[PDB]
């Protein structure tokens with residue numbers, strides 16, 4: 057696709073340039089910092105787009121135009137393909153051309169999907185568009201179900217050609233059949249969901265002067281279609297089977313990496329480092345490593361990951377460690393897990409705290425657990441599942457392993473001169489809720505008194521991993537009424553996390569199979585850029601993202617007593633949900649420039 061093999065390869069490489077769009081876990085990104093998982097300080101709303109999307113002040117002139125990027129790279133793909141058709145065998149063999157075409161095909165499909173999941177019905181662009189094209193020829197949005205069918209067919213075509221697995225040798229992760237099928241699986245699952253399968257809030261939203269074959273001017277189905285779940289199940293089953301066979305993927309299950317890295321097991325309240333507790337404590341560290349390790353470190357769970365990194369300082373506590381020069385290593389402490397998060401991670405028995413007969417009643421959750429020398433730890437934070445201690449952090453508990461000059465950092469969230477609220481000292485920065493997260497934080501992370509620090513070796517940012525494929529299959533079985541099979545899909549994820557398996561006995565009028573799947577997803581994929589899309593596709597924006605839903609402790613008052621601090625407090629920022637927020641508004645200019653384009657409803 058130009059004047060030499062090296063040139064053409066470089067051109068192909070540039071086609072992958074858009075895959076970091078809506079990067080998971082980047083704290084300024086709206087798909088990350090606008091959900092009920094966690095909140096950022098309201099004063100941080102001047103930075104990035106998260107504020108606009110969280111508080112419903114996004115508009116056609118105040119938006120994240122990722123559409124611009126995705127169609128930019130789609131064009132780059134078809135431009136490549138066009139040049140490659142005129143390319144001789146001195147550029148690439150026929151077999152290699154086929155590979156390159158499949159890579160571009162996958163990319164075009166993925167880029168469309170990345171646009172679809174944010175904007176809804178989109179124009180299908182399946183060729184290079186010369187800029188002297190008459191505006192009357194521009195495609196408008198195609199009906200959502202038309203879009204789904206095309207993307208799915210494009211992913212299936214690419215999967216026929218692409219290899220199922222590749223060796224990780226550098227930072228360029230090229231497409232596989234495994235990735236193609238996993239994208240399709242997530243696509244069809246989304247398509248079968250309430251928002252796109254019977255619960256779209258604007259049933260009369262439609263095209264004005266553009267037709268979709270099979271649908272006329274309609275844009276979204278307004279009627280439940282069970283066949284969508286049937287096709288989603290088959291797609292999810294296929295993706296899982298492929299990944300676990302020639303994809304050579306398996307859930308990360310190493311219990312001893314911490315040991316090979318010369319680390320101590322973590323402090324967990326009520327679970328002392330003794331022989332009878334080793335399994336639990338080792339599960340805690342396993343779950344820390346599960347989302348912070350390379351394939352070369354032994355992780356074979358990641359299906360698609362990127363070299364692109366995201367910031368950690370935003371989740372670190374305020375004062376980390378006093379250097380020998382008297383100044384402090386410091387974090388921003390802004391990523392602030394909600395009570396919703398602290399109430400929906402499981403108990404040690406694999407149940408919701410509220411539902412668990414063997415767990416503290418909600419009336420006592422904010423009382424001290426009375427743990428000697430760690431009296432700040434409340435009862436809610438004792439007796440939980442390994443994933444909770446792996447990924448969360450709280451007053452009186454530890455942050456990290458080697459964090460503060462080789463030792464774990466004890467959190468003092470009520471201390472205005474350590475990790476607590478104090479605008480005069482820390483300016484904008486503080487935990488909004490009194491909690492923190494340490495997900496993705498490398499256990500080897502260490503700040504040095506002499507200055508400097510290490511965050512250990514870097515890890516890919518996950519786009520797709522295998523645990524998701526289990527959860528997807530589980531969700532399809534649940535929708536179809538296949539209760540045992542839904543349970544069978546959830547259980548490998550539960551067992552790996554060190555909580556009990558579900559049986560039919562666990563499925564009741566107090567905890568349905570759909571409850572279990574959705575909560576397993578909330579936990580396992582926490583802060584991996586899913587909750588944004590999942591709450592939307594489930595059409596539960598009002599329920600989880602609405603005004604006053606977000607809660608935490610009394611963490612925005614200076615130097616509170618234990619009793620003042622530990623009180624359920626509504627997060628004090630103008631969060632709202634309105635139905636227009638299901639969709640990303642189209643850039644003002646695009647709506648103006650394309651006569652066949654319609655704006656999202658309410659924008």
Ligand SMILES: [K+]
Nearest residue numbers: 221222223224
């Ligand atoms: K790989």
Ligand SMILES: [K+]
Nearest residue numbers: 416435438439
């Ligand atoms: K407890």
Ligand code: NI
Nearest residue numbers: 254255278279
């Ligand atoms: Ni309806």
Ligand code: NI
Nearest residue numbers: 410412415416
């Ligand atoms: Ni209870």
Ligand code: NI
Nearest residue numbers: 647650651653
């Ligand atoms: Ni228009």
